[PDB]
Amino acid sequence: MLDAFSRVVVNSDSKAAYVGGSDLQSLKTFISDGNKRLDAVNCIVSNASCIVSDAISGMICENPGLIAPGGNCYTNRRMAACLRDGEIILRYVSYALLAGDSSVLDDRCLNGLKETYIALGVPTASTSRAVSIMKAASTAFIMNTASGRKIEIAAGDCQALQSEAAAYFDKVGSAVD
Amino acid sequence: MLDAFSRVVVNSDSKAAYVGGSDLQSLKTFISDGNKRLDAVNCIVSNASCIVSDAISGMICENPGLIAPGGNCYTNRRMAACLRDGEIILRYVSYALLAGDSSVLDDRCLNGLKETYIALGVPTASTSRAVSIMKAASTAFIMNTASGRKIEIAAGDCQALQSEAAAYFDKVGSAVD
Amino acid sequence: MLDAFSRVVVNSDSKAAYVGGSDLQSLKTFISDGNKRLDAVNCIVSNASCIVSDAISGMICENPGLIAPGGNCYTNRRMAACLRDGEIILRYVSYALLAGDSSVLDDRCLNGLKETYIALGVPTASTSRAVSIMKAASTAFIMNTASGRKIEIAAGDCQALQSEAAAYFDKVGSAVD
Amino acid sequence: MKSVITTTISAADAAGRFPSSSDLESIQGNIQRASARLEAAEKLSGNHEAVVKEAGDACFAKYSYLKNSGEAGDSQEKINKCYRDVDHYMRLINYSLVVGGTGPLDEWGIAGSREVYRTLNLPGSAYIASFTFTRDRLCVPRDMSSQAGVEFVAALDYVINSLS
Amino acid sequence: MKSVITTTISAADAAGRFPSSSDLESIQGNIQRASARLEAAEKLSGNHEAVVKEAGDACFAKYSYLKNSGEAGDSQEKINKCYRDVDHYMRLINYSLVVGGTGPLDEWGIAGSREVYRTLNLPGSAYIASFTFTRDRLCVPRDMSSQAGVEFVAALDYVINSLS
Amino acid sequence: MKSVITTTISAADAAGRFPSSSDLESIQGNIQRASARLEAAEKLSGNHEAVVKEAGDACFAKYSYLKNSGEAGDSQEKINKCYRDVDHYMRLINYSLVVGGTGPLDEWGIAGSREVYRTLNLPGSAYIASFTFTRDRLCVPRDMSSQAGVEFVAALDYVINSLS
Amino acid sequence: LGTVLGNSSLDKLGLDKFVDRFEVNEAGRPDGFSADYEVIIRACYMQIFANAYIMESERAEMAKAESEFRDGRFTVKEFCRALAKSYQYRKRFFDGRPLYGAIELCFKHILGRTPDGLEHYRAKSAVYDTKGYEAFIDAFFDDGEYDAFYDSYCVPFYRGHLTTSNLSMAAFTHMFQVVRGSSTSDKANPRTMTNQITLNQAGIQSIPLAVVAPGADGATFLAPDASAGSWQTGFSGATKARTSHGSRQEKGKMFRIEVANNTQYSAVGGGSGIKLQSRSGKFYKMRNMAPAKVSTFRRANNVYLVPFDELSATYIKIHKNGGSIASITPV
Ligand SMILES: C=CC1=C(C)[C@@H](Cc2[nH]c(/C=C3N=C(/C=C4\NC(=O)[C@H](C)[C@H]4CC)C(C)=C\3CCC(=O)O)c(CCC(=O)O)c2C)NC1=O
Ligand SMILES: C=CC1=C(C)[C@@H](Cc2[nH]c(/C=C3N=C(/C=C4\NC(=O)[C@H](C)[C@H]4CC)C(C)=C\3CCC(=O)O)c(CCC(=O)O)c2C)NC1=O
Ligand SMILES: C=CC1=C(C)[C@@H](Cc2[nH]c(/C=C3N=C(/C=C4\NC(=O)[C@H](C)[C@H]4CC)C(C)=C\3CCC(=O)O)c(CCC(=O)O)c2C)NC1=O
Ligand SMILES: C=CC1=C(C)[C@@H](Cc2[nH]c(/C=C3N=C(/C=C4\NC(=O)[C@H](C)[C@H]4CC)C(C)=C\3CCC(=O)O)c(CCC(=O)O)c2C)NC1=O
Ligand SMILES: C=CC1=C(C)[C@@H](Cc2[nH]c(/C=C3N=C(/C=C4\NC(=O)[C@H](C)[C@H]4CC)C(C)=C\3CCC(=O)O)c(CCC(=O)O)c2C)NC1=O
Ligand SMILES: C=CC1=C(C)[C@@H](Cc2[nH]c(/C=C3N=C(/C=C4\NC(=O)[C@H](C)[C@H]4CC)C(C)=C\3CCC(=O)O)c(CCC(=O)O)c2C)NC1=O
Ligand SMILES: C=CC1=C(C)[C@@H](Cc2[nH]c(/C=C3N=C(/C=C4\NC(=O)[C@H](C)[C@H]4CC)C(C)=C\3CCC(=O)O)c(CCC(=O)O)c2C)NC1=O
Ligand SMILES: C=CC1=C(C)[C@@H](Cc2[nH]c(/C=C3N=C(/C=C4\NC(=O)[C@H](C)[C@H]4CC)C(C)=C\3CCC(=O)O)c(CCC(=O)O)c2C)NC1=O
Ligand SMILES: C=CC1=C(C)[C@@H](Cc2[nH]c(/C=C3N=C(/C=C4\NC(=O)[C@H](C)[C@H]4CC)C(C)=C\3CCC(=O)O)c(CCC(=O)O)c2C)NC1=O
Ligand SMILES: C=CC1=C(C)[C@@H](Cc2[nH]c(/C=C3N=C(/C=C4\NC(=O)[C@H](C)[C@H]4CC)C(C)=C\3CCC(=O)O)c(CCC(=O)O)c2C)NC1=O
Ligand SMILES: C=CC1=C(C)[C@@H](Cc2[nH]c(/C=C3N=C(/C=C4\NC(=O)[C@H](C)[C@H]4CC)C(C)=C\3CCC(=O)O)c(CCC(=O)O)c2C)NC1=O
Ligand SMILES: CCC1=C(C)[C@@H](CC2=N/C(=C\c3[nH]c(C[C@@H]4NC(=O)C(C)=C4CC)c(C)c3CCC(=O)O)C(CCC(=O)O)=C2C)NC1=O
Ligand SMILES: CCC1=C(C)[C@@H](CC2=N/C(=C\c3[nH]c(C[C@@H]4NC(=O)C(C)=C4CC)c(C)c3CCC(=O)O)C(CCC(=O)O)=C2C)NC1=O
Ligand SMILES: CCC1=C(C)[C@@H](CC2=N/C(=C\c3[nH]c(C[C@@H]4NC(=O)C(C)=C4CC)c(C)c3CCC(=O)O)C(CCC(=O)O)=C2C)NC1=O
């Protein structure tokens, strides 16, 4: 695992050079954007099982063939493992938002997963559908635009961070497809 | 692992309906043939180490190269593992006679075996020879036609079941080749 | 493991009430004394190998019978385990200074140690001697009065915390005897 | 899939010794109770529709609060999900009823029921209302047989004790 | 018991190292968020009674079917069980709120809640109604502080997401 | 690599939990001590050359026997090995100083140093001489700020205590 | 129970349940059935946590590793390693325990024997101190021992009692101190609960321990601690000594008898029901015909060394006081 700090150090490490000015200045922007990232991860962590609920229910409600007999959601067991997979995807996404770098996701969740599914037969476009719903759902929670929970936050602009989280979810969705 | 019951239920489960009368009637024929299957499996379990004795001793005495120096029966250790392997083959065949379905044998004994003998270097035509000897010897014991033991049984015809046991042994012999 | 927060929570939990204002006021004094505790732990952690060096070198140089043939420091292996023991004692004491509570040390380091040293043949009075040397040497580093390393700290009073660390080391020295 | 056959073959297989006379006695008992179980499977395959209709209608003859705000009553569709879930339950009661162990019912239905029911906000108590209703609505010599009814009750009891 | 202190001490302990400066930065943040969390702990210790009374009264401002047949409403005793359960919950929100991690609330309350709630036929959804009521009924500068309100909401969220 | 971020992600991950408020307080502390650490990193990146030159020149202002027979003074090349090793050390103090744990400094530089230094007959005491020289030669209000100085001293202390 | 009767002396030692063995015999990934695996999984928790209690909340911990056993990822060797690395296993066994309590547990969980000599303890503690925790766990798993006995598809079992992994007779007796029959788990079992090292003094010096069967007679007996006399000054009244040297070996061999429940209410002086010192309620024994408030037996569980010709008498007196006899081994 590597955060933003570690990535600056690894990239600067190859040339055997010190942190310098520019890299540290971009990382100063990370620190000043710190609390926004903190409260953002609090927004995605709170109501996260509700994200997984809405996402998978939307995946079945959009594509009714999964619950059709012989589908990959068709069994109570299968639905359990389905919900857990959504939960673990969101889990490592949450860690990628804390770290500010996709190292934990790439090294730990992303690896081996496309092939695991191929053996399983899990439909990959349905998984990328569920990942997309967790993406939009997660960005709507992160922008205080949830139609059910519009909680109090310090007022500001955080479009950078929304683009960041959308980059991680698009990394998972491109990883399964 | 799946018996006859399980296979009817699984086929009707992908069919997604109730079990129904028709499958049930064939399984009633299984039940009424029950005790014949029972005494058949008693016939194969009794005198089975004698089957493996005769089988492997026939496999060496047909093909004298195994016991020749540098063969796969040539070591006393190798002869031990040879005898045991014949015993385990016979064992799972006996289970496939009890269950009335080859699921235990296909999932458990048949799978990975061709790849294992090949890795070992075990000659495959010799194994299919030994499987064939266990086949015909086992059917002759199961039909009370053994030249050494013609024991007392209730009178009847069991050609169905002989065809069944011959199907299991042919499945293993085709599996190694 | 339990810090000072956990001790307030457990005591108020057996008391079965809310934490309340009063306990919280003493814990506010803990938080306002926080940075002194931070710099204190930094003082004991920095130059700690040097503390273990001075302590055990003092224990041998005061009592020359340990290194005598037949002593418990007499073997190179034995001297290794001797040095490590001093290191681990100071390690858990350092944890007890961060937590502000002796839970880690009592549950983990303190328990069964007299019967272990007795069980090995380690003289207990000599261990309490070495623990006492780490006590005084650690308090002299924590008060910036070290004759070799007098580093810069902003000036204040920290007698509370010195009494605390002395309480942990006296707990260990009474624990081995 | 837990049946008498798979149990004894699995156990004697784990032991590693040819199937002895004990397993033979076990499958002897399986072919003894067979006719009773299949009788109950035949009648369940007969009248499954009215079974599920009375089960769901009795489930809302109890708790009405589900179709209020909404917990689960906000469509004819979700109530159709109710009746299809009871269809799946009687389908697995039919399957287990055929096999004669609680194996198929456990591996298809019961394994991992909880994560789903706590996650997708499904109260189990209403399922319990349905099954206890049907379990109360047997007929001893009027419906099937002494052996068939008992068998049916056993299966259904397993469902409720797996759920409550 | 998960706090900042026990996490970093446990981690560096599992490494086998003395505590380095990284742990010290973590507990530096603990002494930064401390005053906000303890403020929220103080106010909850202030008005805990009315908190639990409005929580239970809002729990039965929702689902009335509980006090019917009976599920759990058959006495003033069982409703006393209700208000003491929410007393335990706000008391653990207070404990975790003091410590500042969801450690105590998880190990005292949440660990093994679900087998009790499925075993004693207790619907968790009503708890959810209570806590989401309280969580909706904060006040930004009227009640505590920007950071304290956030801390309190976080703890209560954890409860709901541990339960739903 | 030990930082606050990787410690709490790794620990929360080992729990299997989403990241709770405790980790959030830890990274809150990281962004509290950040400016001090980065200040020290800026000035180290500033005059690293004269730092390494005075460190090595002071390393041979102590032990001169190195450049004798030979241990390690038998070329301008081996003394270049000396100053490049001190270049690597100040480069890792810079790296760890950025990250804010002794993680990078330990995993790159310290881990397995001992077998190399005993294998290539490199005495560790000379390194100690260099670093204790630099650590003695800072300036309290003259360089950086009370807080940055402390951070720098901490890192470099770790090096000496990792090496002796 | 009884070592004869049905021929199976070991089963009645409490180790009858642990015969069950669990080797995956199915090659290739499971899809759907999840019966056999959920059994093997459960057996892994029964071995690794040693019958500790894990809940739905606690089933969320290690859910990922659990979902990797079910896939072509981990052998049960590597799955057992993955359960041994996790948050739970550290909470229970490592964080509460001392490095030697913890070492001894790790052999009960991973290998199912006890450590015999101090050399095992030195090796594993040194691996710990060099590298930390995860390499500690690896150093159990990554050795010839585990690979040979289990082969990576067998869930670990108790083999410390068996004669086939040789060990020492000390490891035999120590085997039964560590396992007390099916209910007792690492947390639950007395003298191994939480932090206390299950056997330090015994485990370090390879002291054979008399084996007391579960249930039976004095199951609830924990040995009284001894100090070392002059050197490292210690109390000298607490227990009988394991050795008995002689000139009292006359009168027949010395029997070290352990008595297990001593109590005021039980101690009667041979005559039924509690005797009253004063007319109105005063029950402790009078010192010099003055009331004392000191328990007649002071710390449940005193031992007795008794030579053979005094056995019967001693055997009577224990039963007079209602003390119950744990184990009687000739010394
Ligand atoms: C660390 C990351 C990580 C993941 C991302 C998952 C990925 C994953 N999923 C499954 C396994 C599974 N995953 C699903 C999920 C699905 N159900 C459907 O209807 C959909 C197509 C899909 C959800 C969108 C199902 C149903 C199974 C079980 C498949 C089966 O047994 O038939 C398995 C095999 C092991 C198991 O059975 O659990 C793995 C490795 N596991 C991990 O360790
Ligand atoms: C320990 C826990 C912890 C947190 C949870 C955060 C909470 C937090 N957020 C902000 C502050 C803020 N938080 C947000 C966040 C956003 N505003 C929007 O309108 C979006 C909905 C949302 C996107 C994430 C913004 C925009 C600010 C103010 C701008 C800024 O401070 O950068 C502040 C500054 C102080 C204050 O406002 O009083 C703090 C402490 N920090 C912490 O230390
Ligand atoms: C569960 C099912 C199951 C099987 C079917 C066997 C299959 C099997 N056989 C061997 C191993 C072996 N099998 C044989 C058998 C042979 N000797 C010959 O002369 C003939 C070609 C052939 C008998 C017809 C021999 C000789 C070995 C040992 C090979 C060697 O070590 O050289 C091995 C490797 C492990 C071992 O040495 O035992 C395995 C997995 N094992 C199982 O677990
Ligand atoms: C527990 C052990 C156990 C057994 C070993 C069997 C023994 C067994 N076999 C039959 C009964 C029988 N067994 C056979 C078997 C055959 N007859 C032939 O001529 C062939 C040689 C042979 C092929 C296998 C036949 C044909 C019957 C009678 C037909 C039938 O009952 O299906 C019966 C019926 C009752 C009776 O005949 O008195 C029983 C109990 N059942 C058991 O429970
Ligand atoms: C991350 C690492 C880390 C540390 C190592 C500490 C370092 C630290 N110490 C103080 C501050 C201080 N430190 C001390 C300490 C003492 N003074 C004495 O004369 C005694 C010798 C010594 C006993 C321990 C005192 C007295 C203060 C000032 C009083 C106070 O702030 O409480 C401050 C306040 C800010 C400043 O002074 O600029 C900081 C950040 N905090 C951290 O975050
Ligand atoms: C093989 C067995 C098997 C089952 C037993 C079911 C169980 C089951 N039910 C639902 C899903 C559902 N089940 C119900 C049923 C309920 N409506 C209520 O008012 C009552 C509380 C209850 C009937 C008694 C509803 C309403 C949903 C949809 C829930 C929702 O989307 O909000 C789902 C999720 C997938 C879906 O939406 O269909 C599953 C797995 N499915 C299976 O494959
Ligand atoms: C496959 C499983 C299966 C069941 C479990 C039953 C369940 C069942 N019973 C009835 C219906 C009925 N069940 C009974 C039975 C009796 N009522 C009494 O008061 C007696 C005590 C008891 C006989 C012992 C009666 C009398 C009716 C018709 C009237 C009624 O509802 O009670 C109905 C409605 C259809 C009908 O009228 O037949 C259904 C679905 N049917 C099935 O097909
Ligand atoms: C320590 C934590 C803590 C809380 C979470 C609150 C919770 C709380 N709020 C109220 C009570 C109240 N809370 C509010 C707040 C407001 N109502 C509105 O409609 C506005 C939107 C909102 C301000 C933003 C109001 C107006 C009342 C009184 C009337 C009411 O119940 O709404 C009460 C009853 C006692 C009273 O009247 O004060 C309690 C327990 N109190 C605490 O001590
Ligand atoms: C340390 C934390 C802690 C808790 C949080 C509680 C949780 C809890 N509640 C109950 C038990 C109970 N809890 C309730 C409460 C309810 N009544 C309803 O109408 C609502 C659904 C709900 C209040 C919102 C009731 C009614 C019972 C008794 C249930 C019964 O006996 O039927 C029990 C079983 C023991 C008992 O009977 O008391 C437990 C463990 N106990 C604890 O030790
Ligand atoms: C990333 C960090 C990093 C380091 C810190 C260095 C550390 C280091 N130094 C040497 C190797 C060396 N280092 C020195 C240095 C010394 N000469 C002396 O007189 C003094 C005692 C000392 C300088 C103070 C010398 C002389 C060698 C060569 C030794 C030899 O070949 O005899 C080697 C072996 C490989 C080589 O020959 O270069 C390594 C790994 N390398 C790294 O990759
Ligand atoms: C009937 C036969 C019989 C014996 C043979 C002795 C053996 C014996 N010695 C000691 C005890 C002792 N024995 C010694 C003797 C030693 N001092 C050393 O420097 C040497 C290694 C060694 C003499 C060669 C010492 C020093 C003690 C006291 C040990 C202590 O308290 O630390 C004890 C314990 C009781 C006690 O303290 O006296 C016993 C049983 N006792 C017996 O009843
Ligand atoms: C009929 C079958 C069906 C569904 C099921 C939904 C599922 C769904 N939710 C979405 C997206 C979505 N879902 C939620 C979560 C959700 N909203 C909340 O305010 C609360 C409290 C929630 C959990 C209870 C949010 C927050 C969003 C983002 C949009 C928004 O701002 O609401 C999106 C948009 C995806 C995208 O942007 O690519 C879809 C498709 N849609 C369907 O057609
Ligand atoms: C000279 C090298 C040599 C051998 C060794 C034998 C081996 C042998 N046994 C056979 C077959 C065979 N073997 C036995 C078992 C055997 N018979 C019994 O009655 C008892 C008690 C037995 C164990 C002691 C039976 C029961 C049969 C079936 C034929 C029969 O009815 O006897 C068959 C026929 C295979 C087939 O049908 O394809 C062969 C080749 N043959 C050889 O040429
Ligand atoms: C001949 C066998 C022998 C020894 C070995 C020493 C060991 C020793 N160090 C002490 C105490 C001691 N030791 C140090 C640490 C030490 N001093 C420094 O300035 C630096 C850099 C150190 C590590 C290299 C300090 C700082 C003190 C406190 C006294 C002081 O101010 O120096 C004390 C006093 C203990 C007390 O106060 O109770 C002793 C006995 N003494 C012996 O008789």
3-state secondary structure G111-166: HCCCCCCHHHHHHHHHHHHHHCHHHHHHHHHCCHHHHHHHCCCECCCCCCCCCCCC
- Which residue does chain D place closest to A56, by CA atoms? D120
* Furthest-apart CA atoms within chain C: distance in Å: 61
* CB G21 less than 6 A from any atom of ligand 11: no
Experimentally, the structure was elucidated by: cryo-EM
User: For residues B9 and F102, what is the distance between their CA atoms, to the nearest angstrom?
Assistant: 62
User: For residues B114 and B120, what is the distance between their CA atoms, to the nearest angstrom?
Assistant: 10
Q: Minimal CA–CA distance to D55: which of D112, D136, D139, D163?
A: D136
The C-alpha R_g of chain C, in whole angstroms, comes to 18
- Which residue does chain A place closest to D104, by CA atoms? A75
Q: What is the DSSP letter of G23?
A: B
Best probe of the F interface among E8, E18, E25, by most F CBs < 10 A, is E25
Burial G274-304 (b: 16+ CB within 10 A, else e): eeeeeeeeeeeeeeeeeeeeeeebeebbbbb
Terminal-to-terminal C-alpha distance of chain D: 22
To which H or E segment does residue B125 belong?
A: helix B124-142
Could you tell me if C51 and C57 are in contact, meaning their C-beta atoms sit under 8 angstroms apart? no
Q: What is the DSSP letter of C64?
A: T
Could you tell me if G224 and G301 are in contact, meaning their C-beta atoms sit under 8 angstroms apart? yes
User: For residues F33 and E24, what is the distance between their CA atoms, to the nearest angstrom?
Assistant: 10
Taking a contact as any Cβ pair under 8 Å apart, which residues of chain E between 52 and 111 contact chain D? 63-65, 71
Could you tell me if C168 and C102 are in contact, meaning their C-beta atoms sit under 8 angstroms apart? yes
Partnered with residue G306 across adjacent β-strands are G255
Q: Which long-range contacts (CB under 8 A, 24 or more apart) does C151-156 make?
A: C151/F153, C152/F140, C152/F146, C152/F149, C152/F150, C153/C39, C153/C43, C154/F146, C156/C36
Size of interface F-G (CB pairs under 8 A): 12
* CB D140 less than 6 A from any atom of ligand 7: yes
Partnered with residue G328 across adjacent β-strands are G257
The crossing angle, in degrees rounded to 10, of helices G99-106 and G118-131 is 110
D14 and G CB contact within 8 Å? yes
The upper half-sphere exposure of residue A26, i.e. CA atoms within 13 Å in the direction of its Cβ, equals 10
For F125, phi then psi, to 5°, come to -60, -30
Partnered with residue G83 across adjacent β-strands are none
Q: Minimal CA–CA distance to B130: which of B161, B96, B93?
A: B93
G304 three-state secondary structure: strand
The crossing angle, in degrees rounded to 10, of helices F21-46 and F4-15 is 150
Partnered with residue G256 across adjacent β-strands are G305, G329
User: For residues F35 and F13, what is the distance between their CA atoms, to the nearest angstrom?
Assistant: 28
User: For residues E25 and F31, what is the distance between their CA atoms, to the nearest angstrom?
Assistant: 9
User: For residues A47 and E161, what is the distance between their CA atoms, to the nearest angstrom?
Assistant: 7
* Furthest-apart CA atoms within chain A: distance in Å: 61
D40 three-state secondary structure: helix
Which residues from chain F sit within 8 angstroms of residue C151, using beta carbons? 153
For G96, phi then psi, to 5°, come to -70, -40
* Furthest-apart CA atoms within chain E: distance in Å: 61
User: For residues G331 and G329, what is the distance between their CA atoms, to the nearest angstrom?
Assistant: 6
Q: Is G72 exposed, middle or buried (0-12, 13-18, 19+ CB in 10 A)?
A: exposed
User: For residues E97 and E41, what is the distance between their CA atoms, to the nearest angstrom?
Assistant: 6
D102, D162, E40 from B13: Cα distances, Å: 16, 21, 56
Which residues from chain A sit within 8 angstroms of residue D119, using beta carbons? 49, 52-53, 83
For G307, phi then psi, to 5°, come to -75, 160
User: For residues G159 and G157, what is the distance between their CA atoms, to the nearest angstrom?
Assistant: 6
Tabulate helix, strand, coil % of chain D (nearest 5): 75, 0, 25
Residues with CB under 6 A from ligand 14: C 50, 54, 57-58, 61-62, 133, 136-137, 140-141, 145-149
Q: How many angstroms separate the alpha carbon of residue E138 from the centre of ligand 8?
A: 7
Candidates G194, G205, G231; nearest CB to C119: G205
User: For residues F157 and E21, what is the distance between their CA atoms, to the nearest angstrom?
Assistant: 11
The crossing angle, in degrees rounded to 10, of helices D4-15 and B76-99 is 170
Give the strand order in the sheet containing G254-259: G303-307, G254-259, G325-330
Could you tell me if G192 and G176 are in contact, meaning their C-beta atoms sit under 8 angstroms apart? no
Could you tell me if D131 and D55 are in contact, meaning their C-beta atoms sit under 8 angstroms apart? yes
Q: How many angstroms separate the alpha carbon of residue B38 from the centre of ligand 4?
A: 7
Q: Minimal CA–CA distance to G222: which of G188, G199, G206, G204?
A: G199
Helix locations, chain G, DSSP H: 36-48, 56-60, 63-69, 76-85, 87-89, 99-106, 118-131, 133-141, 144-150, 169-178, 201-205, 311-321
Terminal-to-terminal C-alpha distance of chain E: 23
For G255, phi then psi, to 5°, come to -115, 125
User: For residues C132 and C54, what is the distance between their CA atoms, to the nearest angstrom?
Assistant: 12
* CB A128 less than 6 A from any atom of ligand 1: no
Tabulate helix, strand, coil % of chain G (nearest 5): 35, 5, 55
- Which residue does chain F place closest to G84, by CA atoms? F14
Q: Gaps after which residues in chain A, C–N over 2.5 Å? A: none
User: For residues B12 and E7, what is the distance between their CA atoms, to the nearest angstrom?
Assistant: 53
Q: Do B9 and D108 touch (CB under 8 A)?
A: no
- Which residue does chain E place closest to C109, by CA atoms? E13
Paired tokens of G223: 């040995």
User: For residues A90 and A50, what is the distance between their CA atoms, to the nearest angstrom?
Assistant: 11
Best probe of the C interface among F138, F145, F147, F161, by most C CBs < 10 A, is F161
User: For residues B94 and B41, what is the distance between their CA atoms, to the nearest angstrom?
Assistant: 7
Helices vs strands, H then E, count in chain B: 9, 0
Could you tell me if F21 and E102 are in contact, meaning their C-beta atoms sit under 8 angstroms apart? yes
User: For residues C105 and C168, what is the distance between their CA atoms, to the nearest angstrom?
Assistant: 9
User: For residues G195 and G94, what is the distance between their CA atoms, to the nearest angstrom?
Assistant: 9
Q: Do G34 and D1 touch (CB under 8 A)?
A: no
Could you tell me if E103 and E37 are in contact, meaning their C-beta atoms sit under 8 angstroms apart? no
Q: How many angstroms separate the alpha carbon of residue D106 from the centre of ligand 7?
A: 27
To which H or E segment does residue B117 belong?
A: helix B113-120
F15 and G CB contact within 8 Å? yes
CA G158 from chain center: how many Å? Answer: 13
The crossing angle, in degrees rounded to 10, of helices D21-59 and D124-136 is 100
Q: Do E164 and A50 touch (CB under 8 A)?
A: yes
CA dihedral B150, B152, B157, B161 (to 10 degrees): -70
Could you tell me if G156 and G79 are in contact, meaning their C-beta atoms sit under 8 angstroms apart? no
Of the residues A79, A83, A84, A126, which should be mutated to test ligand 6's pocket, given the most ligand atoms within 8 Å of the CB? A79
User: For residues D139 and E34, what is the distance between their CA atoms, to the nearest angstrom?
Assistant: 67
Phi-psi category of residue G263: left, alpha or beta, with phi > 0 → left and psi -120 to 50 → alpha: beta
Helices vs strands, H then E, count in chain F: 8, 0
Q: Minimal CA–CA distance to A88: which of A104, A101, A72, A77?
A: A104
Q: Do F14 and G62 touch (CB under 8 A)?
A: no
User: For residues E153 and A39, what is the distance between their CA atoms, to the nearest angstrom?
Assistant: 12
